[PDB]
């Protein structure tokens, strides 16, 4: 016989980071976290490969 395994994990972002997130050098508006979510997205994509 044979039986598979299950692998899941979560990742959250609270209000204070999703509202207050600019950069360091520039006076950039608060829409930076919508670019930073894609990094954790492709990181979970690359982390399911490592199992």
């Amino acid at each position: 016989t044979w039986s598979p395994l299950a692998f899941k994990e979560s990742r959250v972002w609270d209000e204070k980071e999703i509202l207050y997130l600019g950069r360091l050098a520039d006076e950039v508006q608060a829409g930076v976290i919508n670019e930073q979510i894609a990094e954790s997205l492709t990181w979970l994509m690359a982390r399911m490969r490592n199992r």
């Binding site: 209000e15 509202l19 508006q29 829409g31 976290i33 979510i37």
Partner: protein, 51 residues
């Protein structure tokens, strides 16, 4: 509003003294990103399929 027996005195010019700035808040999911809106906001919570 003006307390009885007390008066304000303007000095330089009868005009605007500074501005009431707003600050952006969170609205969500345009496509996969976040969209921020400046002024006051009224969000509903349609829980008419909840128990």
């Amino acid at each position: 509003w003006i307390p009885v027996g007390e008066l304000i005195v303007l000095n330089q010019s009868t005009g605007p003294v500074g501005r009431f700035v707003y600050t952006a808040h969170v609205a969500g999911q345009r496509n996969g990103k976040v969209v921020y809106a400046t002024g006051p906001y009224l969000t509903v919570k349609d829980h008419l399929q909840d128990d």
